[PDB]
Amino acid sequence: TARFDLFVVGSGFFGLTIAERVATQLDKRVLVLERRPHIGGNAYSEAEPQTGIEVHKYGAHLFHTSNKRVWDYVRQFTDFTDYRHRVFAMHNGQAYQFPMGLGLVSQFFGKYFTPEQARQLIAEQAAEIDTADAQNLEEKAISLIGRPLYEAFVKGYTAKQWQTDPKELPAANITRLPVRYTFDNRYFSDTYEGLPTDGYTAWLQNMAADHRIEVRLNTDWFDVRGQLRPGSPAAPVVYTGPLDRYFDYAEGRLGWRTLDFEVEVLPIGDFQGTAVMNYNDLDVPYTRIHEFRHFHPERDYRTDKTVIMREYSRFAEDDDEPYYPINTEADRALLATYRARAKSETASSKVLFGGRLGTYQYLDMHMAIASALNMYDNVLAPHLRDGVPLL
Amino acid sequence: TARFDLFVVGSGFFGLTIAERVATQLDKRVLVLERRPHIGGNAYSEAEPQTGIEVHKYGAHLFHTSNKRVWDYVRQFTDFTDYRHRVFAMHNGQAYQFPMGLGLVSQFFGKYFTPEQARQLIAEQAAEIDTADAQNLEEKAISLIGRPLYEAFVKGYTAKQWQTDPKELPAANITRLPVRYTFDNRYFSDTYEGLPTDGYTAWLQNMAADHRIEVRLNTDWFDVRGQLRPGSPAAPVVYTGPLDRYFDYAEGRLGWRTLDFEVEVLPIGDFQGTAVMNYNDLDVPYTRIHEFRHFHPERDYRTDKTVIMREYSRFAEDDDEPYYPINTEADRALLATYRARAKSETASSKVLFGGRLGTYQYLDMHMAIASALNMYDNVLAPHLRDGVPLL
Ligand SMILES: Cc1cc2nc3c(=O)[nH]c(=O)nc-3n(C[C@H](O)[C@H](O)[C@H](O)COP(=O)(O)OP(=O)(O)OC[C@H]3O[C@@H](n4cnc5c(N)ncnc54)[C@H](O)[C@@H]3O)c2cc1C
Ligand SMILES: Cc1cc2nc3c(=O)[nH]c(=O)nc-3n(C[C@H](O)[C@H](O)[C@H](O)COP(=O)(O)OP(=O)(O)OC[C@H]3O[C@@H](n4cnc5c(N)ncnc54)[C@H](O)[C@@H]3O)c2cc1C
Ligand SMILES: O=c1ccn([C@@H]2O[C@H](COP(=O)(O)OP(=O)(O)O[C@H]3O[C@H](CO)[C@H](O)C(F)(F)C3(F)F)[C@@H](O)[C@H]2O)c(=O)[nH]1
Ligand SMILES: O=c1ccn([C@@H]2O[C@H](COP(=O)(O)OP(=O)(O)O[C@H]3O[C@H](CO)[C@H](O)C(F)(F)C3(F)F)[C@@H](O)[C@H]2O)c(=O)[nH]1
């Protein structure tokens, strides 16, 4: 007589992966509850009416992974193009090859450097701190790319994105970018990469297309959990919303970063001649500019119009939507207290916590999907199928 | 009682395509005669013993095509990697993004140019001649990329490759390179591109693997045609050797360009950090340098050794192997006389002429394969199957 076998809070890639796996592999009924008027979370996309160009409404999303299982899993719901993401950096009125590589070095220092000459120069300029003993973002970056490059391509950019002292930011944030001594300027270094052939929304709709999956939009979990859970007493709950918001900020508010976007349809065919242009200087407010027509070069759009998007970073207010965890020393101490409360909620009320917002972690699409598969394999499936305790 | 149904002179991509199609689609026996001690022509490759790195013995060969039929045809004999060829240009001790694009323009002129600002600058600097009215290479290049770029990236390079006045060289030679106003630096602009997964030699061996195809190496056609053709009187002949050499240079010698190579195994892991580096300046003898480890970035070779190859251009002597047709006005006049003789040989002795050497034409791998398929479909197959006259 139980209506649902599982509750899922959030229709992001983590939530949809969980819902899809439980519904199709266990033949169970899943209710997905979404606060927003649309599914997919921040991966939600829409076609711009004038051009037909797919616009990433919540910031550019580029898919990439070296996990074969994840790669094989996502291909069940969408095809991928042969797109290879590349980023250019604007500094002092000049566009630079990016990231760290022979192109960047040769441009910034005025002459060509062999792979060995480049390693030497950097080694010299990284002498202050070694890579292994780097506590924070600043120590890590300087140890990897040297100081003169750090000031001209990291200092200003980091200040605009976090508004937090780099000595207080995690070192893992900078290791997201590949450190290279070749002319290769692929922004990612994963085995598999590409954009959804028919868009992200179509991809996300396929994952929730199963008839055993019900998605209720414009619905807040905390407004309806009092009535739904009695309808299905034994049904566990997978929560992917903000971790601190779940406990009503009892111990305090975790530091988040949010983003403002500026979408504009220009009466020209090409604005910058590339997909993403980073702006490292402080004389400009936005961190970077996206031109979505270059996301799909295999497609042919009108050559008299183009759609660009400028990106702005600031602290996430109470009514803002959290995009990036800050993870300072104070933030991590607060996180540990919420992790304890979360661990108690699992034992007391069968509530699991996952996703970027649910765990306060810097998660990409492929990392959240992989994390969702792990939670399913090791936690959810043994419980829903064999009755194994959730923790 | 006829031993062979077809004679093929040359085991290049043109010759092997012809042989493979006739043998498998018509169930006919084909004799392939090769002057060299190996098959594949200039596409022949070998693994360097110290590293295991595939070396293109007769110059770097990059496959690319927009022809779906050709693409589907070649995949029957080999797989292709996701390799995308890119070339960098060395000038005045600095490495430049190549070819014509926003990267090159921004580097050479000292500041960033928008796609519109770039079109303006070039337009100004191309004012002398318009693209449509370009008679030769020099007029075509200047009309496309402007003069200051022409002198710094085309003048010196063209002088080293052809040693012929650019006003006397074909305009089609420069249109091989994509003219761009974006940051895209893909050297080719075809739909399909990649390198043979298991090497070129394995690819070529598969095309001639059929039991109805016999390949005789170290055999010159003109030494054995007197005895072979009586053995198979009705068998046509597909000749892919030098057109003028076939008629013993009766009307004169066509102008060809040959190449000398300098292969070296260096005691370092990386020489230039990219596959191909062009040298546009005259203060260096070689036209470009290839580093073959970057041809296959999906592979992992030893990091203490690397194999490079320097390329030198000069006029093809009598004992040299012709690589590039010069095609001056005098050359084309001589070609017209050989085309008439060739047309007579087809009527009198059933001898077809194809390939880069057989037609004195600037042919790529995909263009020769496509040309071979056309000759098969429209000429050879109707003759060998229905008895239709060859011309
Ligand atoms: C600006 C930005 C850029 C990114 N770029 C990339 C990229 O380039 N490549 C890449 O691989 N990844 C990228 N990511 C990461 C990726 O978008 C997400 O991690 C991904 O969607 C994974 O799912 P998630 O569960 O963390 O969903 P999230 O989208 O982080 O959000 C999950 C959902 O929970 C819902 N929710 C929250 N609270 C409630 C509630 N109370 N009731 C109901 N629903 C609720 C929200 O509506 C939200 O839709 C980016 C993320 C951001 C923010
Ligand atoms: C230096 C160079 C670089 C190239 N790079 C590329 C590239 O990057 N991408 C691309 O798509 N294409 C490239 N090509 C083109 C390509 O290599 C050839 O066009 C291709 O092999 C097509 O076949 P072909 O018949 O023209 O054979 P070719 O190799 O031009 O030669 C055909 C064969 O005829 C044989 N032969 C000649 N005379 C006799 C005789 N009397 N008896 C017996 N045999 C004879 C020769 O041994 C030779 O092997 C390049 C060519 C050269 C020369
Ligand atoms: O020019 C730069 C670029 C980055 N950084 C530092 O690296 C950190 C992370 O860089 P990222 O590019 O990974 O930042 P993200 O916003 O998470 O990455 C998004 O932006 C990219 C746009 O090309 C991609 O869309 C993406 F995949 F990496 C992203 F979507 F997640 C930054 O926070 C900053 O501190 C710099 O310091 N300077
Ligand atoms: O820097 C340059 C480069 C090219 N050129 C002009 O374009 C003409 C053709 O350029 P190409 O690159 O097509 O010359 P090719 O030798 O036929 O091309 C070979 O070299 C390339 C190496 O990256 C590729 O391997 C290839 F495919 F294009 C090639 F094998 F055929 C040149 O003859 C020259 O006049 C220049 O003037 N300057």
Tell me whether residue B257 is one of the annotated catalytic residues.
yes
- Shared domain for A260 and A350, answered yes or no, is no
Considering B176, B216, B302, B314, which one is annotated as catalytic? B176
Ligand 1 pocket, residue A213 CB under 6 Å: no
Phi, psi for A72 (deg, rounded to 5): -70, -30
Residue ranges with strand state E in chain B: 6-9, 30-33, 45-47, 54-56, 63-65, 87-91, 94-97, 192-194, 213-216, 237-239, 256-266, 276-279, 288-291, 306-315, 324-325, 351-353
- Give the nearest partner residue to A273 out of B107, B183, B271, using CB atoms: B183
Q: Are residues B270 and B368 in the same domain?
A: no
Burial environment of residue B211 by CB neighbours within 10 A (0 to 12, 13 to 18, 19 or more) = exposed
What atom of ligand 1 comes closest to residue A12's alpha carbon?
A: 27
β-strand A63-65 against A192-194: which pairing, if any?
antiparallel
CATH of the domain at A8: 3.40.50.720
Q: What's the domain range around A147?
A: 85-187+256-327
Asked if A65 contacts A110 with a C-beta cutoff of 8 angstroms, the reply is: no
Distance from CA of A294 to the nearest CA of B (A): 10
Indicate whether B161 and B29 sit together in one domain.
Answer: no
How far is ligand 3, taken at its centre, from the CA of residue B111, in Å? 24
Our answer to whether residue A257 is catalytic in this structure is yes
Resolution (A): 2.2
Paired with B46 in beta bridges are B55
**Domain match, B110 and B169 both:** yes
Q: Please check whether residue B79 is in contact with residue B197, taking contact to mean a CB–CB distance below 8 angstroms.
A: yes
How many folded domains does chain B comprise? 2
Q: Which of B54, B371, B369, B375 is nearest to B192 (CA)?
A: B369
Same domain, A132 and A238: no
Q: Quick check: CB of B241 below 6 Å from ligand 2?
A: yes
Residue A137 CA from chain centroid, whole number: 18
- Nearest-angstrom CA–CA distance, B322 and B324: 6
A253 is an active site residue? no
A183 and A277 co-located in one domain: yes
Annotated binding residue at A3?
no
Q: How far is it, in rounded angstroms, from Cα A240 to Cα B236?
A: 73
Q: Where are the beta strands (DSSP E) in A92-168?
A: 94-97
**Breaks in chain B, after residue numbers (C to N greater than 2.5 Å):** none
Give the closest-approach CA distance of A88 to chain B in angstroms. Answer: 9
Instruction: Calculate the alpha carbon distances from B93 to A6, A95, A106, B54 in Å.
Output: 65, 20, 10, 29
Sheet harboring A288-291: ordered strands across?
A94-97, A87-91, A276-279, A288-291, A306-315, A256-266, A324-325
CB atoms B181 and A115 under 8 Å: no
* d(CA B44, ligand 2 centre) in Å: 9
Residue nearest ligand 2's atom 7 by CA: B61
Kind plus residue range of the DSSP H or E element containing A54: strand A54-56
Contacting residues of B for A83, CB less than 8 Å apart: none
Q: A214: which strand partners?
A: A31
Sign of CA dihedral A54, A56, A62, A63: negative
Residue B53 burial (10 A CB sphere; 0-12, 13-18, 19+)? buried
Please tell me which residue of chain B has the smallest CA distance to A81.
B82
Start-to-end C-alpha separation, chain B: 26
Q: Do B182 and A294 touch (CB under 8 A)?
A: yes
| B102 lies in the same domain as B239 | no
Strand partners, A288: A278, A311
Q: Could you tell me if A47 and A80 lie in one domain?
A: yes
Residues A154 and A195 in one domain: no
Sign of CA dihedral A238, A244, A246, A247: positive
| Cβ–ligand 3 contact at A158 (below 6 Å) | yes
Method in brief: X-ray
| Residues facing residue B257 across a β-bridge | B315, B324
Q: Is B339 a catalytic residue?
A: no
Tell me which of A327, A354, A376 is where a domain ends: A327
B84 is catalytic: no
Residue A33 · residue A9 · CB < 8 Å: yes
Q: What distance in Å separates the CA atoms of residue A83 and residue A380, rounded to the nearest whole number?
A: 35
Same domain, B66 and B192: yes
Q: Which of B34, B31, B33 is CA-nearest to residue B23?
A: B31
**Same-domain check for residues A163 and A214:** no
Last residue of a domain, one of A277, A301, A327: A327
How far apart are the CA of B87 and the nearest CA of chain A, in angstroms?
A: 10
Beta carbons of B339 and B345 less than 8 angstroms apart: no
Residue where a domain terminates, one of A276, A300, A327: A327
